[PDB]
Amino acid sequence: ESETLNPSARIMTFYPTMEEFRNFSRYIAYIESQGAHRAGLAKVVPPKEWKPRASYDDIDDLVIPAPIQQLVTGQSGLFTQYNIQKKAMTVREFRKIANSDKYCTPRYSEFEELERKYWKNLTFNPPIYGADVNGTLYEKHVDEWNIGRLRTILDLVEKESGITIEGVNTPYLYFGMWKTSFAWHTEDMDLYSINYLHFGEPKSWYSVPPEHGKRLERLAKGFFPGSAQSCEAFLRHKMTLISPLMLKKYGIPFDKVTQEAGEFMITFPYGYHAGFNHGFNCAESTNFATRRWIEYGKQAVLCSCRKDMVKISMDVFVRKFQPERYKLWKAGKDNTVIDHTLPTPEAAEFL
Numbered sequence: 001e002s003e004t005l006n007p008s009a010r011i012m013t014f015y016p017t018m019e020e021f022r023n024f025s026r027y028i029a030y031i032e033s034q035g036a037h038r039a040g041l042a043k044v045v046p047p048k049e050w051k052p053r054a055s056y057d058d059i060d061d062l063v064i065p066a067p068i069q070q071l072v073t074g075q076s077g078l079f080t081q082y083n084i085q086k087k088a089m090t091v092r093e094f095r096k097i098a099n100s101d102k103y104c105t106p107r108y109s110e111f112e113e114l115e116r117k118y119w120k121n122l123t124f125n126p127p128i129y130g131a132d133v134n135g136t137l138y139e140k141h142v143d144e145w146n147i148g149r150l151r152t153i154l155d156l157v158e159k160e161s162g163i164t165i166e167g168v169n170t171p172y173l174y175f176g177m178w179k180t181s182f183a184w185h186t187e188d189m190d191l192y193s194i195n196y197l198h199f200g201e202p203k204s205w206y207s208v209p210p211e212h213g214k215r216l217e218r219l220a221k222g223f224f225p226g227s228a229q230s231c232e233a234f235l236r237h238k239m240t241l242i243s244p245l246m247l248k249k250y251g252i253p254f255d256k257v258t259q260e261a262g263e264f265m266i267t268f269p270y271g272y273h274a275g276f277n278h279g280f281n282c283a284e285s286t287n288f289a290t291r292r293w294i295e296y297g298k299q300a301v302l303c304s305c306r307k308d309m310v311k312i313s314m315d316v317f318v319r320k321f322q323p324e325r326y327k328l329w330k331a332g333k334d335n336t337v338i339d340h341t342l343p344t345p346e347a348a349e350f351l
């Protein structure tokens with residue numbers, strides 16, 4: 001039973017062997033079989049034997065075409081992040097700024113100390129995030145967990161229509177510095193995501209279980225009624241930051257995890273997450289899908305107030321994987337209800 005596995009919906013950590021690590025979709029289905037998805041977020045530590053690139057010593061020349069300065073406004077654990085686009089710059093130039101005294105990591109003993117400082121100084125001295133950089137740091141030959149070519153069914157989007165959506169079915173790189181942030185969100189079309197930390201200081205994550213996502217939404221709508229009235233899904237703007245103390249105070253279940261260089265994070269459909277970087281680092285990510293995602297995709301509530309928001313046609317997926325329901329679905333009469341505790345069909349061999 002779905003409900004009997006990971007009943008506390010806690011973030012799980014997995015240490016696959018090299019044999020397990022080789023088939024990406026298999027291991028995703030496997031960790032789902034262990035209830036990992038119920039947390040919304042999971043950590044996967046790859047075998048020590050494994051490395052996606054021999055050396056990162058060459059990248060100081062790589063261009064960050066649109067660095068973003070992150071202005072944050074708010075109080076009492078509620079904040080809204082405004083992006084200001086800076087002029088292009090190099091990893092060398094970025095690293096110099098990031099390690100500079102003005103911008104570098106404050107010192108501290110335990111994580112909770114660094115965490116407290118993040119939520120205390122969030123609004124002061126705005127950092128720069130080298131974000132949404134198109135590209136990959138994977139060497140052309142690495143066949144395990146290659147973010148450039150995961151070969152999941154998300155590939156049906158490009159295959160059928162030729163459409164690429166930057167960062168979604170293509171890779172993004174993220175160059176961080178201390179106190180740079182990602183706001184509370186689910187992925188576009190409530191897909192999965194994979195995030196790999198190539199190098200640098202840690203990246204910390206908060207997550208809310210999918211079975212409690214709607215609860216976080218009610219709370220957010222209550223605290224940002226203006227934004228809620230203007231948009232059916234304003235959290236998709238990725239501007240909204242909420243401190244873990246505010247989540248506790250209003251009884252939203254959540255969990256924390258800190259990601260180290262060379263570690264993977266997997267986010268699951270309708271898994272709300274947010275977080276921040278500890279210092280200079282580099283992360284790579286993209287979205288992907290499983291058969292389980294399709295229903296999430298069919299029902300995802302999208303941003304209504306922008307023309308350039310990401311919308312994937314679900315049609316090809318329903319035809320190919322839910323043929324019984326296609327007619328009904330197209331007639332707007334498909335009332336399937338989602339069970340967030342259930343694992344993906346592909347795990348039939350591990351169920």
Ligand SMILES: N#Cc1ccc(O)c(-c2cc(C(=O)O)ccn2)c1
Nearest residue numbers: 174181182187188193195203238283
């Ligand atoms: N803006 C934005 C945005 C859109 C989609 C995403 O998955 C993330 C995101 C970014 C990070 C990160 O900046 O490290 C971690 C997790 N999620 C951020």
Ligand SMILES: [Mn+2]
Nearest residue numbers: 186187193267
């Ligand atoms: Mn994300």
Ligand SMILES: [Zn+2]
Nearest residue numbers: 231303304305
């Ligand atoms: Zn919107």
